[PDB]
Amino acid sequence: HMTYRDAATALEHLATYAEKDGLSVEQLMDSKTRGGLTYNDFLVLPGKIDFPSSEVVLSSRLTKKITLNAPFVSSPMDTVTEADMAIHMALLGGIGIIHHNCTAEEQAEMVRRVKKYENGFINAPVVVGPDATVADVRRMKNEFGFAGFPVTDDGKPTGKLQGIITSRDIQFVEDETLLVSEIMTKDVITGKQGINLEEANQILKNTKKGKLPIVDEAGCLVSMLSRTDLMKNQSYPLASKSADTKQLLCGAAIGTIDADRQRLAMLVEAGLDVVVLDSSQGNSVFQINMIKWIKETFPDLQVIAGNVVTREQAASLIHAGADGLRIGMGSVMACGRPQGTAVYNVTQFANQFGVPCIADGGVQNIGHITKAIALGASTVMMGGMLAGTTESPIDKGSIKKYIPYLYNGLQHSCQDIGVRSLVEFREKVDSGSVRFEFRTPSAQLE
Amino acid sequence: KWIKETFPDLQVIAGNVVTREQAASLIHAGADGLRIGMGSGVMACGRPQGT
Amino acid sequence: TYRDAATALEHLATYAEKDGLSVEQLMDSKTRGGLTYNDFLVLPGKIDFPSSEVVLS
Amino acid sequence: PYLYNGLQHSCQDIGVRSLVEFREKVDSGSVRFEFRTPSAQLE
Amino acid sequence: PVVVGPTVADVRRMKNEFFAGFPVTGIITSRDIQFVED
Ligand SMILES: Nc1ncnc2c1ncn2[C@@H]1O[C@H](COP(=O)(O)OP(=O)(O)OP(=O)(O)O)[C@@H](O)[C@H]1O
Ligand SMILES: Nc1ncnc2c1ncn2[C@@H]1O[C@H](COP(=O)(O)OP(=O)(O)OP(=O)(O)O)[C@@H](O)[C@H]1O
Ligand SMILES: Nc1ncnc2c1ncn2[C@@H]1O[C@H](COP(=O)(O)OP(=O)(O)OP(=O)(O)O)[C@@H](O)[C@H]1O
Ligand SMILES: Nc1ncnc2c1ncn2[C@@H]1O[C@H](COP(=O)(O)OP(=O)(O)OP(=O)(O)O)[C@@H](O)[C@H]1O
Ligand SMILES: [Mg+2]
């Protein structure tokens, strides 16, 4: 009996409403009405799905000149990012920022291993000298779990290669005091530095040998291939690499004190790609001077300044020449800002100048990542949620599984919202197509 | 659309939706009812159920 | 097309207000009265001096 | 002294050289504030 | 004196259960099956 509208007019009828359902980003982030928000205070509303999640592209600008295939950045914490974390973050499409709670020499070495790392090779081989006993070798086999040790004249990883000693050589040996030199293979098949993974593998098939030490023109060991390792066949088609040298990208943090000017020189000399100026209140004369000295002194270095939480801070450090900004303060404290409000107001100002911003702090799951980007962040930094992983200095497993899980999770969230890439996500938020809803305390518990 | 053409005596409830635009889309497609709710069963995408 | 970084400071004048709330806007009984210290934060400004120079008279 | 030094640093972060200056800048609108939602406090 | 007569994947499973030095009933050991693709 009662009269309803014809279903065929349903789409036409959406035009009778003054606004799309939900709030635009500007309406959500109103300081007067709704105050400082964090990620947990709101949601992104779903849109229309007309594509699979596998098609979503997550390219993200880290700096004006550096672009990553994933918006993930590991934090410069001594519990999070050292050389091992930076290598795998780069391999999986992001980047690591090595901490500076160490000597300048130690930091430069860690940067060096990242820049020199070659996938598929044992880049830091365990070695033994010739004057050691079989008993010494066997002890190493139990502690490390592998026995394939090349022997160098000085017993150091970079010494001149004399031979190779493996488990097969020492399994049945009597008289444990005998030296490695007596038992070892003197004539070692090797490969020249610069051989590629395919070329090295074929040599192992031809020679049916377990290991292939790699030596330089002076005969010093550089790396080694394990036949077992290639059999896993791990590939990294999203690896983050420098444009010029095609080496893995590497980042590093420093302070603004005078001693850190020499610290950074050592990092640049190790091949550092991007430096993060590490400070809780970055809008200072000390950091501004530091930015200007870097841009004139190291012409090929990208600089991320911070931390900032306000538009005024952002404008100051952009004027000084920053290549990116790091957003966050305290996400009890007197000075700071709720992270969501911070990201929105900085990035709304900074994105007009093309300065990408890292959202640093308060990220614990895929939901925080999506919301951080939704409010204007180009990349997101991760600390606690990466601590405890295998590649960190709890028991969360390897980031080789975790980062793809987060990568896949961010693809699905983009699909639900209805955007095919982070570039499109940014445009749709800023045009008002993507909609948001503020959450009451009860809703969060729901 | 395939259901409404293939099974003439079958009623279809589509979902889940939480927004007007979602609802308008699935009604235009021919839904006989809608199922409302997203994230009430932390997550990035959803809406408080009452709203 | 992005804005020139050299204009960043000049561009702050295009906004009607500074980022954040003034104290008068924060302490509005009608909008959100009844605040304690834990209900707000002070936003940071610009550092151009060491902390040892601050006078607490 | 710990509290004395702590108040100096917080004044530095805000950008004021003295408590007299702190008062003047607040009352002129130069010092800015942000209201915290309950979720922000737990953060 | 365990032994196994005439595939390579079945020999990798028998090593886990037990030792891969099993004569064909004439010998196959771990070294032979370590890096076999098929
Ligand atoms: N010299 C080395 N330095 C570091 N890692 C090594 C070294 N030799 C082997 N490995 C690692 O040990 C693991 C096994 O490789 P491999 O199986 O080739 O060692 P093995 O010495 O061959 O052990 P087995 O006694 O089982 O023959 C791989 O992950 C490989 O990277
Ligand atoms: N790259 C190499 N060039 C020349 N000889 C090698 C090389 N690598 C290992 N050898 C020697 O050749 C023999 C086999 O090397 P392998 O490393 O294959 O033994 P294992 O790997 O120790 O035992 P398994 O092969 O059972 O894991 C050993 O005597 C070893 O010393
Ligand atoms: N190059 C410099 N020359 C002089 N003083 C400096 C320099 N760099 C930093 N400072 C001062 O040293 C103190 C710490 O600077 P930092 O960059 O460490 O800020 P923070 O990280 O906020 O310190 P905390 O972590 O204790 O808060 C600040 O008071 C800052 O003004
Ligand atoms: N065919 C077998 N039948 C019974 N026990 C065996 C057999 N092969 C190996 N073992 C057990 O392993 C011990 C040593 O054998 P060995 O270790 O010499 O062969 P492997 O175990 O095959 O060596 P790898 O496992 O290192 O290739 C024997 O003393 C016995 O306990
Ligand atoms: Mg081996």
Residue numbers in the entry:
A (entry chain C): 0 to 330, 339 to 400, 455 to 507
B (entry chain B): 291 to 331, 339 to 348
C (entry chain D): 2 to 58
D (entry chain D): 465 to 507
E (entry chain H): 124 to 129, 132 to 143, 145 to 151, 162 to 174
Manuscript text:
Most IMPDHs are homotetramers in solution with each monomer composed of a catalytic and a regulatory domain. Adenine and guanine nucleotides compete for the canonical binding sites of the Bateman domain, inducing different IMPDH conformations with significantly different catalytic activity. These nucleotides control a conformational switch that allosterically regulates the catalytic activity of IMPDH.
To elucidate the details of the differences between ATP and GTP-induced octamers, we solved the structure of AgIMPDH co-crystallized with ATP at 2.4 Å resolution. The crystal belonged to the space group P21 and contains a complete octamer in the asymmetric unit. The Bateman domains were clearly visible for all eight monomers, and each of them contained two ATP molecules, as well as a Mg+2 ion, bound to the nucleotide canonical binding sites. In the AgIMPDH-ATP complex, both ATP1 and ATP2 adopted an extended conformation that coordinates a Mg+2 ion between their β- and γ-phosphate groups. The hydroxyl groups of the ribose moiety tightly interacted with the side chains of the fully-conserved Asp168 and Asp228, which constitute an archetypal sequence signature of CBS motifs. There was no clear electron density for a significant part of the finger domains, suggesting that they are mobile within these octamers. Unexpectedly, a third ATP molecule was bound in the catalytic domain, in the adenosine sub-site of the NAD+ pocket, within the active site. As expected from our SAXS results, the conformation of the ATP-induced octamers significantly differed from the GDP-induced one; the later were compacted along the four-fold symmetry axis and forced the finger domains of the upper and lower tetramer to interact. In contrast, the former were stretched out along the four-fold symmetry axis, allowing the fingers to move freely in the bulk solvent. In contrast, ATP2 did not interact with either the catalytic domain or the linker regions.
